[PDB]
């Protein structure tokens, strides 16, 4: 997260980081037993963590489970993104104010609407520098035609770009499969940009809504 | 000879550990990969990485 703040310890219950010997992704958790993340993140081994916020030091409030399933989106196009979304199975369910689940949206979000993103990955536009600690950013939706305009012909109905135009705050590398959640609800997922909070580049995120039917019937049967 | 292209990152914004070939170096070093649209010289491990660009 380039230009955000610090969240604060576990204000941010449904945050999880997916850890193959380090932090390589984030998640969100939807439900005692379920992850959703990105497509992009799918790697054999994934050792999720629940109730982190310093990912280096034990602190006492974490959960670390290992997957079971990790069930790719059967659309998922490796080459244009689309449908950059991915369900994970815990090995065994969480024990639910540290670590909590988040709500699935009923509708759409509009343009204008102010979202929290969260995650471990890249604080600096140029340069490296991860943070121990995790990371927020208010950001708004944009539309989708101002989208398109910052990315001719590479934004599909299942993506939504959020930030600022100006550059300067945006997700960065590290931060991929975690929440974008306005209004409580879930509304994207951090998928990809050009580079980091550059700038007319904002983030582009997997419009969730549009997968709802597909994850609750995905859960349902395994 | 895509051993000697630079390592590439890519757009997605995930923090993977790969190797690539650094011909300047003669050796495999790693860098962060984002998730997706690899170009070649991006490796799993060093040893894949020695024997397919090791000695470019
Ligand atoms: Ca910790």
């Given at each position: 997260?380039?230009?955000?703040?610090?969240?604060?310890?576990?204000?941010?219950?449904?945050?999880?980081?997916?850890?193959?010997?380090?932090?390589?992704?984030?998640?969100?958790?939807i439900?005692?037993q379920?992850?959703?993340?990105?497509?992009?993140?799918?790697?054999?081994?994934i050792?999720v963590?629940?109730?982190?916020?310093?990912?280096?030091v034990?602190?006492?409030?974490?959960?670390?489970?290992?997957?079971?399933?990790?069930?790719?989106h059967?659309?998922?196009?490796?080459?244009?993104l689309?449908?950059?979304?991915?369900?994970?199975?815990?090995?065994?369910?969480?024990?639910?104010?540290?670590?909590?689940?988040?709500?699935?949206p009923?509708?759409?979000?509009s343009?204008?609407t102010?979202?929290?993103?969260s995650?471990?990955?890249?604080?600096?536009?140029?340069?490296?520098?991860?943070?121990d600690v995790?990371?927020?950013?208010?950001?708004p939706?944009?539309?989708?035609?101002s989208?398109?305009?910052?990315?001719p012909?590479?934004?599909?109905?299942?993506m939504?770009?959020?930030?600022?135009?100006?550059?300067?705050?945006?997700?960065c590398?590290?931060?991929?499969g975690?929440?974008?959640?306005?209004?409580?609800?879930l509304?994207?997922?951090?998928?990809?940009?050009?580079?980091?909070?550059?700038?007319?580049?904002?983030?582009?995120?997997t419009?969730v809504?549009?997968?709802?039917?597909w994850?609750?019937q995905?859960?349902?049967?395994? | 000879?895509?051993?000697?292209?630079?390592?590439?990152?890519?757009?997605?914004?995930?923090?993977?550990?790969?190797?690539?070939?650094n011909?300047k170096?003669?050796?495999?070093?790693?860098?962060?990969y984002?998730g997706?649209?690899?170009?070649?010289?991006?490796f799993?491990?060093?040893?894949?990485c020695?024997?397919?660009?090791?000695?470019?």
């Open positions: 997260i380039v230009g955000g703040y610090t969240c604060g310890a576990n204000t941010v219950p449904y945050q999880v980081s997916l850890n193959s010997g380090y932090h390589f992704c984030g998640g969100s958790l439900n005692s379920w992850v959703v993340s990105a497509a992009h993140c799918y790697k054999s081994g050792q963590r629940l109730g982190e916020d310093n990912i280096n034990v602190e006492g409030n974490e959960q670390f489970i290992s997957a079971s399933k990790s069930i790719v059967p659309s998922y196009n490796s080459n244009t689309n449908n950059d979304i991915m369900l994970i199975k815990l090995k065994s369910a969480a024990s639910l104010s540290r670590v909590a689940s988040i709500s699935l009923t509708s759409c979000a343009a204008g102010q979202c929290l993103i995650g471990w990955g890249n604080t600096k536009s140029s340069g490296t520098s991860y943070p995790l990371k927020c950013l208010k950001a939706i944009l539309s989708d035609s989208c398109k305009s910052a990315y012909g590479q934004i599909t109905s299942n939504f770009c959020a930030g600022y135009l100006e550059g300067g705050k945006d997700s590398q590290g931060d991929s975690g929440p974008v959640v306005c209004s409580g609800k509304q994207g997922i951090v998928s990809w940009g050009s580079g980091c909070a550059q700038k007319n580049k904002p983030g582009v995120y419009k809504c549009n997968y709802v039917s994850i609750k995905t859960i349902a049967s395994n | 000879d895509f051993c000697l292209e630079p390592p590439y990152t890519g757009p997605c914004k995930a923090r993977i550990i790969r190797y690539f070939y011909a170096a003669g050796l495999c070093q790693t860098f962060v984002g997706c649209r690899a170009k070649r010289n991006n799993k491990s060093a040893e894949d020695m024997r397919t660009c090791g000695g470019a």
